[PDB]
Design an enzyme around this catalytic site. Structure first.
Site, PDB file in Angstrom:
ATOM      1  CE  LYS A   1      -4.409  -1.339   2.042  1.00 53.10           C
ATOM      2  NZ  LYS A   1      -4.080  -2.761   1.825  1.00 53.10           N
TER       3      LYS A   1
ATOM      4  CD  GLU B   1     -12.316   5.781   0.181  1.00 49.15           C
ATOM      5  OE1 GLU B   1     -11.703   5.257  -0.776  1.00 49.15           O
ATOM      6  OE2 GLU B   1     -12.901   6.881   0.102  1.00 49.15           O
TER       7      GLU B   1
ATOM      8  CB  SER C   1       0.140  -8.131  -0.568  1.00 44.62           C
ATOM      9  OG  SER C   1      -0.645  -8.906   0.318  1.00 44.62           O
TER      10      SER C   1
HETATM   11  C1  LIG Z   1      -5.047  -3.844   1.672  1.00 48.33           C
HETATM   12  C2  LIG Z   1      -4.164  -5.088   1.402  1.00 48.33           C
HETATM   13  C3  LIG Z   1      -4.524  -6.005   0.365  1.00 48.33           C
HETATM   14  C4  LIG Z   1      -5.720  -5.910  -0.539  1.00 48.33           C
HETATM   15  O1  LIG Z   1      -5.841  -4.783  -1.374  1.00 48.33           O
HETATM   16  P1  LIG Z   1      -5.398  -4.841  -2.860  1.00 48.33           P
HETATM   17  O2  LIG Z   1      -5.744  -3.477  -3.334  1.00 48.33           O
HETATM   18  O3  LIG Z   1      -6.236  -5.914  -3.498  1.00 48.33           O
HETATM   19  O4  LIG Z   1      -3.957  -5.091  -2.949  1.00 48.33           O
HETATM   20  C5  LIG Z   1      -3.687  -7.103   0.179  1.00 48.33           C
HETATM   21  N1  LIG Z   1      -2.547  -7.341   0.936  1.00 48.33           N
HETATM   22  C6  LIG Z   1      -2.200  -6.452   1.939  1.00 48.33           C
HETATM   23  C7  LIG Z   1      -0.930  -6.790   2.724  1.00 48.33           C
HETATM   24  C8  LIG Z   1      -3.013  -5.345   2.150  1.00 48.33           C
HETATM   25  O5  LIG Z   1      -2.613  -4.515   3.145  1.00 48.33           O
END
Ligand SMILES: *Cc1c(COP(=O)(O)O)cnc(C)c1O
Ligand SMILES: *Cc1c(COP(=O)(O)O)cnc(C)c1O
Ligand code: NA
Lengths: 385, 387
Positions: free
Chosen positions: B82, B104, B371
């Site tokens: 993010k 948001e 992620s």
């Molecule tokens: C918020 C988040 C997501 C999901 O959001 P995407 O926009 O689909 O990437 C996935 N992995 C993590 C670690 C997140 O913080």
């Protein structure tokens, strides 16, 4: 083994054999091709080395003093510098044919670092922890368990770190054949103070190369917080010979030095023997290991590494102290100003670098070792409420 | 602006101006020399890019299947991908002369990433968050405050994300002069879905170069969890034209698809219009945004970005789902096996790749986009699993 009159191997006969095997193994491997190829591979693809050197522009300007650079150790896998040393000894133990890692831990932070490494290299991991600490660090205990390590509470003695250390030694004496005693800071009997420092020096090498690229010159002052003293040495060492580079170590002032509630071994401790080494420790009038207090969990060790006591003697490095209140203020400041939440330990170095910067000229460079991130300290800080 | 029939600017007249200004601003700065120099500066010294590409040797072997690689977005500053988007948009807002950032957030993760970037660039940050979510994410709310951001609970409507989004648009309509609306995923009205993906594509590029260096060849399958779809689009994009590369997005199966207790917009949602876009959303029989369920906080978004709906359509990418139970298992697995505690979101991708691996040859490569890290999830996992 000796940094002036500090260091040594104050250990039972039983521990002499393992310690020599360890020192021998480290000698050969220290610069062996593969070992280093492997170490640098994990350090890179797993720990994410190298960490960046960040210039805290907003903070410096808000103080209108020297330039404040943060060596971002808070970005290494795990969130703390301890990971460097952990991969090192774990990998060494692997090369020694060892299959089990043991260690003691106060806050539980080193325990986690060990558990991570153990898990990475498929080694069994047993962590001794004073029952007192275990009941204080529910999350780190949980963390170690998630990583696959076993947490062994210690109810003997005062149920604290010193008790964990004894139990750890006990175990090693009998299992050293296939078990490695992973020490977490630049402390303990030789060769530990040396091994740990070598494994952390990589911080200082990068930080040197990085400051030369960003400023074309070495820094004026290097500030790091000091518990056992490993992150301080890791970034101090590469600059020990660069005479112009001032080295400042910061210890926990706790509630204030005159209040007895702190953990400033160098500034308020006495020389003695503990954990198999001769250095500064916080005792009581009976030579028994005295308490430690610091809003920072990691600044709990009742002493300091021998190389630091040495450096203090020959005056190559200056050691100060910052109170809980000051560190806690620095914690809030970095977060708000640079969008970085530092570990409470690191907040001690930040707090001091801030005072220091204010009394310096715009183009004097201060390199603060941000040893870790503060995600782990959110609960305790949530003090502020 | 359109990915097939998905996308658009389904917004009020009052929003057409700021949106056009934003798109104009992005167009020029998109490849400006200075802007990019600053972006790469911050991405490097502050966020720590590039993140490595780790080979989970122990995991791969323990499954005896394809090679399992992990793009370590868990090591980026903040612990999640993010941050890449937060920096990019915050910086863009800076260049636009904006002095305030609004946003948001559902779980508060995007809230935190915006707070950090705002703090980094000396901008005022106001985060709208449904009171419901505020009361359930005590630690992130605190994290945001520590970063100097103002958390605005929203009690109107159902006190959730959709309500938070309405207040955010409201605010932007009146303050777009000096305020930038920082959307957290490849969603929303144009140009957002395009801007977010551009700021996240750096993940794919790095991963492309890194896999070529480690295997001299592209990967067989790329797996990434999908909430709004930003980390998936960031790592997918660079490989879209590499026809031989398999693209798998993983949605939250929650308690199980047939139970309805999930957050799988692509696999179980319907085409709709929300947050200013025409894409797939989870809506009740009355076209109202339906509640979502996932053990992974960040997979709470009730829909999906238009570009993913498009990729699904033309079949360039395949989308599956993984249950809470399965993700939770991968959570524990990765932790004991590689010494890496993944985010519950990423645990979904990991869980699927693991299954996918076992049905592949050992010379086959799978790149999982990790992620984020799991430090933020320890509390929920402690309650759910115990110990
Ligand atoms: C918020 C988040 C997501 C999901 O959001 P995407 O926009 O689909 O990437 C996935 N992995 C993590 C670690 C997140 O913080
Ligand atoms: C453990 C720890 C320390 C203190 O130990 P040293 O060996 O003195 O470095 C400092 N900072 C962090 C982030 C720690 O985890
Ligand atoms: Na979704």
């Amino acid at each position: 083994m000796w940094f002036g009159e500090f260091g040594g191997q104050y250990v039972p006969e039983t521990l002499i054999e393992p310690l020599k095997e360890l020192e021998k193994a480290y000698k050969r491997f220290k610069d062996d091709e593969e070992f280093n190829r492997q170490l640098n591979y994990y350090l890179k693809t797993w720990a994410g080395r190298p960490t960046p050197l960040y210039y805290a522009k907003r903070l410096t300007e808000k103080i209108g003093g020297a330039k404040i650079y943060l060596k971002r150790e808070d970005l290494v896998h795990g969130g703390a510098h301890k990971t460097n040393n952990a991969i090192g000894q774990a990998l060494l133990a692997k090369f020694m044919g060892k299959t089990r890692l043991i260690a003691e831990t106060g806050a539980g932070q080193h325990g986690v670092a060990t558990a991570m490494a153990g898990a990475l290299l498929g080694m069994k991991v047993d962590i001794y922890m004073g029952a007192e600490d275990v009941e204080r660090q529910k999350m780190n205990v949980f963390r170690m368990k998630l990583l696959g390590a076993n947490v062994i509470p210690v109810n003997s003695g005062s149920r604290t770190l010193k008790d964990a250390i004894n139990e750890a030694l006990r175990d090693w004496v009998a299992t050293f054949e296939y078990t490695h005693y992973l020490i977490g800071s630049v402390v303990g009997p030789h060769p530990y103070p040396t091994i740990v420092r070598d494994f952390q020096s990589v911080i200082g090498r990068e930080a040197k190369a990085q400051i030369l690229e960003a400023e074309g010159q070495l820094p004026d002052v290097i500030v790091a917080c000091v518990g056992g003293g490993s992150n301080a040495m890791g970034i101090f060492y590469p600059f020990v010979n660069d005479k112009k580079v001032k080295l400042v170590g910061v210890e926990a002032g706790g509630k204030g030095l005159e209040s007895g509630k702190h953990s400033a071994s160098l500034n308020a401790g006495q020389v003695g023997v503990f954990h198999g080494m001769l250095s500064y420790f916080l005792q009581d009038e009976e030579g028994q290991i005295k308490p430690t207090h610091s809003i920072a969990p990691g600044l709990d060790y009742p002493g300091v590494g021998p190389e630091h006591a040495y450096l203090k003697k020959i005056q190559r490095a200056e050691y100060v102290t910052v109170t809980d209140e000051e560190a806690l203020k620095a914690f809030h400041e970095l977060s708000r100003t640079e969008g970085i939440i530092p570990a409470l330990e690191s907040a001690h170095a930040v707090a001091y670098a801030m005072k220091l910067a204010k009394e310096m000229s715009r183009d004097e460079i201060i390199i603060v070792n941000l040893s870790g991130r503060g995600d782990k300290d959110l609960d305790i800080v949530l003090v502020s409420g």
